[PDB]
Amino acid sequence: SASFKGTDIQEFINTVSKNLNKTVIIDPSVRGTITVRSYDMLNEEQYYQFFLSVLDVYGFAVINMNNGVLKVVRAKDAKTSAVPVASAAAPGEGDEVVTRVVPLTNVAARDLAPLLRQLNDNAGAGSVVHYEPSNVLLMTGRAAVIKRLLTIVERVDNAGDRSVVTVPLSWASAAEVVKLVTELNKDTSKSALPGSMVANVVADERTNAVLVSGEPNSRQRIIAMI
Amino acid sequence: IIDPSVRGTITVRSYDMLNEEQYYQFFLSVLDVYGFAVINMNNGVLKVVRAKDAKTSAVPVASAAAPGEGDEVVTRVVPLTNVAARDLAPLLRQLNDNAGAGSVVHYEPSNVLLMTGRAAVIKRLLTIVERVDNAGDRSVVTVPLSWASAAEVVKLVTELNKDTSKSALPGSMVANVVADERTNAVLVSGEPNSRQRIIAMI
Amino acid sequence: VSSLKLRLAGLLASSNPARSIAIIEKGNQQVSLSTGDPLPGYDARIAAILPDRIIVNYQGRKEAILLF
Known part of the structure; x- marks a missing residue:
């Protein structure tokens, strides 16, 4: 059971380590203590789980290795030459630090970078966000952060990107209609919004139908007018 | 041989025994924690530096078959073949700005991509480029056409899918289209989640 | 106690x-x-260490030590 009262972080690592039976190297400039009362018992896996969680609260972070056991850093960063990177099948769990990446396929990867570098500006040497003309979208963060942000892009990118559909026409003129659509629904003193989420229209004279492309709550208007 | 200006101590309790290879392994790891770094040599044994840099005239460089292991310091290089080697250099000089005289990143018009870093860093960064460069670079494919006009279609594609008030993105990850009038087919080139749209319209 | x-x-x-x-x-x-x-301070022997109390044979007597 995790019954630790005023226990120093040093004797925390040096005792909990004993129980865990794993080697550990502490670095200097690590000064402090915890205190906690626990009622349920945590040795099987929730031992190491909650251990790393407690280290996470103070932000003193650790990285574990394969041949030897983990270590304690005071730099708190992924810059430690150690960053086990998930490959979208192992999200891990909130405690560990990974470095994930995704090729975002529909959206400019610049503008979500300030909002995300802010929303997730972890002030304990947390992740960063960068753009490459190959639209790589990478970060390191934590493993719980992964859930929230994956969910972010997967929802915001799945917001009805470009799709195309047409409509034939029984008898009316073709080039004349579109020739008269961008005059009835063109603009305003201030743009409804940026170039996306608004549809453009062209037409051929060959099959006497008209072309639209856009979003599932933009095109419906166009079909309304026609 | 130890150098001066090396003042400090460690402390650690270990339960398992480490002499065979994990001895030297963990030894160098401990030196690595404080950032006091060492380089080993062939004729004589290693030394301890206070400059912490690859600038020491000693940098055994792996050749992509020996990645080594996290403890040692190498100087690796790769000819990156698909991407401008400038812009990933700030993000990587930051992500990997080792403040103990860690690696650097430079560009040559031959697209050399070099660094020194550590040996564990090698894994993460090799994996980086190998994933980001393998992200669906330029490939070409065509489509014939039964009866409709050729030059007229493409002549009318860059009007329906051309731009927006703000660019979808930089010049990559977006396809360009031309066509000949000779075989009555049309040309596309781009990325495996960009071209599919073009085939949709056609 | x-x-x-x-x-x-x-x-x-x-x-x-x-x-x-x-x-x-x-x-x-x-x-x-x-x-x-043995205890470095006093001549006491720790009989057992229970998860809820401490049993130490001090002067041939059993004493229960509760949490602080």
């Missing part, structure tokens, strides 16, 4: 390769002790 002026700072479960492990602080100095080792 126990009459010894000792404050329990930590009490973890018994490790795998050992029988028991308990951290005891005395005189502002922290030290790790096990089941069977």
Whole structure:
């Protein structure tokens, strides 16, 4: 059971380590203590789980290795030459630090970078966000952060990107209609919004139908007018 | 041989025994924690530096078959073949700005991509480029056409899918289209989640 | 209760390769002790280390040490 009262972080690592039976190297400039009362018992896996969680609260972070056991850093960063990177099948769990990446396929990867570098500006040497003309979208963060942000892009990118559909026409003129659509629904003193989420229209004279492309709550208007 | 200006101590309790290879392994790891770094040599044994840099005239460089292991310091290089080697250099000089005289990143018009870093860093960064460069670079494919006009279609594609008030993105990850009038087919080139749209319209 | 002026700072479960492990602080100095080792301060022997109390044979008597 995790019954630790005023226990120093040093004797925390040096005792909990004993129980865990794993080697550990502490670095200097690590000064402090915890205190906690626990009622349920945590040795099987929730031992190491909650251990790393407690280290996470103070932000003193650790990285574990394969041949030897983990270590304690005071730099708190992924810059430690150690960053086990998930490959979208192992999200891990909130405690560990990974470095994930995704090729975002529909959206400019610049503008979500300030909002995300802010929303997730972890002030304990947390992740960063960068753009490459190959639209790589990478970060390191934590493993719980992964859930929230994956969910972010997967929802915001799945917001009805470009799709195309047409409509034939029984008898009316073709080039004349579109020739008269961008005059009835063109603009305003201030743009409804940026170039996306608004549809453009062209037409051929060959099959006497008209072309639209856009979003599932933009095109419906166009079909309304026609 | 130890150098001066090396003042400090460690402390650690270990339960398992480490002499065979994990001895030297963990030894160098401990030196690595404080950032006091060492380089080993062939004729004589290693030394301890206070400059912490690859600038020491000693940098055994792996050749992509020996990645080594996290403890040692190498100087690796790769000819990156698909991407401008400038812009990933700030993000990587930051992500990997080792403040103990860690690696650097430079560009040559031959697209050399070099660094020194550590040996564990090698894994993460090799994996980086190998994933980001393998992200669906330029490939070409065509489509014939039964009866409709050729030059007229493409002549009318860059009007329906051309731009927006703000660019979808930089010049990559977006396809360009031309066509000949000779075989009555049309040309596309781009990325495996960009071209599919073009085939949709056609 | 126990009459010894000792404050329990930590009490973890018994490790795998050992029988028991308990951290005891005395005189502002922290030290790790096990089941069977003598006390450096007084001539007392630790009989057992229970998860809910401490049993120490002080002067041939059993004393219960509760959490602080």
